[PDB]
Design a protein around this ligand. Sequence first.
Ligand code: A1AW6
Length: 209
Amino acid sequence: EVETFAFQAEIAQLMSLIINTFYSNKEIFLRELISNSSDALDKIRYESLTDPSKLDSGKELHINLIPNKQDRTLTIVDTGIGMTKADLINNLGTIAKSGTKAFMEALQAGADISMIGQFGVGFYSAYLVAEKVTVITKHNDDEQYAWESSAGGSFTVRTDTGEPMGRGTKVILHLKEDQTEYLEERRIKEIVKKHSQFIGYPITLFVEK
Ligand SMILES: NC(=O)[C@]12CCC[C@H](CCC1)C2
């Protein structure tokens, strides 16, 4: 049972700008997704300070980077607070309408796409490198869901029958054909070292057979 939703017009416009603007510095997508994971991990950590049972769904707080050259996917996994179904539908837990307005007002005044995270909509930088993004998520207060979009103005949400996650979020980037450098170990290592040196959770780069 799959539900299909239209993006709000402002979010569709954000996504088309990310997809269509000539902009070479695409590697910032990974910094933005790792920063989102760190934010989600901070949230579950904070809740656990007054209620240890919040970690009954998993005590480890970490970020895993999983490249798969056969599937042409880069997956960013975190064990943060996750998202409810309502969060997914409401722009993946962001205030994306007001964030997009500010971001586009910053671009016309000289900002560039790399500053997207200052406007709270860094998730959508995934579309710099991915033709399709799948988000699997599990929040303590809801069931496990899969969100998916290839842009084009719509996204889907369905209950996820896949491998149970416990708690957190998995962002699966189905990479564009010309963006496979982001599956190479040395390239991912370089980006993490350059942009994510002060992320306070272990980032494990998985290797492939
Ligand atoms: N959080 C981590 O695992 C890192 C992130 C930056 C690159 C490496 C150096 C120590 C911190 C690993």
